[PDB]
Amino acid sequence: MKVRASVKPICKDCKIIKRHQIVRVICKTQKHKQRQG
Amino acid sequence: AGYPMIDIKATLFDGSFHEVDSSEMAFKIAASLALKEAGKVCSPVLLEPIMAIEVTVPEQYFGDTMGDISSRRGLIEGTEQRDNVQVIKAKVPLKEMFGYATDLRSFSQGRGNYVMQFSHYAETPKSVVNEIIA
Amino acid sequence: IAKINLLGGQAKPGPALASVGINMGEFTKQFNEKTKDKQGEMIPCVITAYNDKSFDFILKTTPVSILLKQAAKLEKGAKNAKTIVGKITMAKAKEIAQYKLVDLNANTVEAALKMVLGTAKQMGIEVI
Amino acid sequence: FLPSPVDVPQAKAYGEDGNEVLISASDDAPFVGLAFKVATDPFVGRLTFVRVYSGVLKSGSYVKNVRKNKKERVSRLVKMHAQNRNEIEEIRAGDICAIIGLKDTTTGETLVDDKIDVQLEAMQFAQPVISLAVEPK
RNA sequence: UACUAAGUGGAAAAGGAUGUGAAAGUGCUAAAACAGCAAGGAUGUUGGCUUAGAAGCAGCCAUCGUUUAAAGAGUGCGUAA
């Protein structure tokens, strides 16, 4: 993942979740995984 | 660049007539320079060998060599079977031939080997020919 | 396994019938006699498992859109329906209909004619 | 399990001088000497590694090269062991020797003194294939 | 009483957020849909052009016929085809 400021579901699996109060996207496409949406 | 001008026809068309002289070897040099100027202005095309590959690869990198030749844009209409190897009847350009053995081996442990037969000279593709025209 | 759009004569090219478990030539000799009546345009061939593969080989009907092109006297038309350039004649149309009738899921000759015209719009021919 | 040079199945030699026939390498009177390797040295002369297949290699006189078909004047012969260069004159069949000097020798030539048949070998080796250009300077 | 679990109170921006409860229009099922699965999910067709057989699917398209509960030259994958 990488820190961002706005999550965009650029993949079908991009689930916007919050792990340890960090809002990220979990998805199969590891290219699109980001942080701090 | 001094490349061999082979497989080319030359045609004489016309000369001139005169009574008081206009002798012979003047016509010689005129014809020579005419042929040379025509060769200059011809915008020529070149010939290189694009060789049909008899790819004899053991059946563990058969798919790897298949993909490699597909990246090299070869004509693999099929593959004949053998004891432990498969032989691909493909085509490879001489430009992609430079290091073809080395690259195929670096992608296939070196067991993926090569059998290369010399083919008749064919017209250089548009990319190769235009880099030499001058 | 593998289904191939094989030839009518030799079947040597292709790493799908040479080694699926069976030797090439001993089935090639059958291929020269079981398919000599199925020549012309490239005919489909389907491999299966008898033990792994040695028997139980039959040929599906030819893919009549390039045999349909040859019915238009053509090898390349277009990627879509275009101006009329060929015509599948009476005997050719009827034999293609009866030829597809068993390959298809259909029941009637009219469904076969609809079939032939349905792929006829990829090169630009009308199936009469 | 790796026996004498007579119990081993001898390698075949098709001499290029017109005797391309099946011959043996058993130890016997006739002598054949094949220079299977060479090395360079300015001071002591060229150091050519040879294999003795049959007979004895004479020295101190003119040695015949059948490939060149001429007699060459030699001065000294040698053997480079694992850690020494012993100046020698004769090595029997089944073993390897060398000539210190002999600036005209090829891989496959047959040095003879008893006039044995020819064993010029060139077909058992193959081509380094795949080209890389070299430009002039 | 409606809501919250951020102490939001007791800081906050463009932008972004399948944010909580509740609620306005839009459907079936109540007989048992829908979801996952038991599973059928197919058929000409490797249609051709290029691409080698990229030809269900390197890529394009006519993608229409049909059996039907369903189907697409396939959601796609797998692919040398």
Swiss-Prot record, chain A:
GO CC, sorted alphabetically, is:
cytoplasm; ribonucleoprotein complex; ribosome
Q: Which UniProt keywords apply?
A: Ribonucleoprotein, Ribosomal protein
Domain of life of the organism encoding this protein: Bacteria
Coiled coil (residue ranges): none
**UniProt xrefs under PROSITE patterns:** RIBOSOMAL_L36
Q: Name one Pfam family in it.
A: Ribosomal_L36
Give a GO biological-process term: translation
Q: Which SUPFAM superfamilies does the protein's record reference?
A: Ribosomal protein L36
Work out whether the entry's keyword set contains Ribonucleoprotein: yes
Question: What are the GO MF terms of this UniProt record?
Answer: structural constituent of ribosome
Q: Does the keyword Ribonucleoprotein apply?
A: yes
Write down the NCBIfam families for this protein, in alphabetical order.
rpmJ_bact
PANTHER family given in the database record: 50S RIBOSOMAL PROTEIN L36, CHLOROPLASTIC, LARGE RIBOSOMAL SUBUNIT PROTEIN BL36C
Per the record, the similarity remark reads: Belongs to the bacterial ribosomal protein bL36 family.
Name of protein: Large ribosomal subunit protein bL36
Species of origin reads Mycoplasma pneumoniae (strain ATCC 29342 / M129 / Subtype 1)
Q: From which lineage does this chain's organism come? A: Bacteria, Bacillati, Mycoplasmatota, Mycoplasmoidales, Mycoplasmoidaceae
Curated annotation (Swiss-Prot), chain B:
Which cellular compartments is it found in?
A: Cytoplasm
Relate the protein's function as given in its record.
Answer: Catalyzes the GTP-dependent ribosomal translocation step during translation elongation. During this step, the ribosome changes from the pre-translocational (PRE) to the post-translocational (POST) state as the newly formed A-site-bound peptidyl-tRNA and P-site-bound deacylated tRNA move to the P and E sites, respectively. Catalyzes the coordinated movement of the two tRNA molecules, the mRNA and conformational changes in the ribosome.
Family statement: Belongs to the TRAFAC class translation factor GTPase superfamily. Classic translation factor GTPase family. EF-G/EF-2 subfamily.
Q: Indicate what this protein is called per its UniProt record.
A: Elongation factor G
Q: Which organism is it from?
A: Mycoplasma pneumoniae (strain ATCC 29342 / M129 / Subtype 1)
- Gene encoding this polypeptide? fusA
- Interval of the full protein contained in this chain: 552 to 685 of 688
UniProtKB/Swiss-Prot annotation, chain C:
A Gene Ontology molecular function term for this protein is: structural constituent of ribosome
Does the keyword field hold Chloroplast? Answer: no
Tell me the function of this protein.
Forms part of the ribosomal stalk which helps the ribosome interact with GTP-bound translation factors.
Which gene underlies this protein? rplK
- The name on file for this protein is Large ribosomal subunit protein uL11
Q: Which PANTHER family match?
A: 60S RIBOSOMAL PROTEIN L12 (PTHR11661), LARGE RIBOSOMAL SUBUNIT PROTEIN UL11M (PTHR11661:SF1)
Q: Which organism's genome codes for this protein?
A: Mycoplasma pneumoniae (strain ATCC 29342 / M129 / Subtype 1) (Mycoplasmoides pneumoniae)
Report keywords, A-Z.
Answer: Methylation, Ribonucleoprotein, Ribosomal protein, RNA-binding, rRNA-binding
Q: How is it modified after translation?
A: One or more lysine residues are methylated.
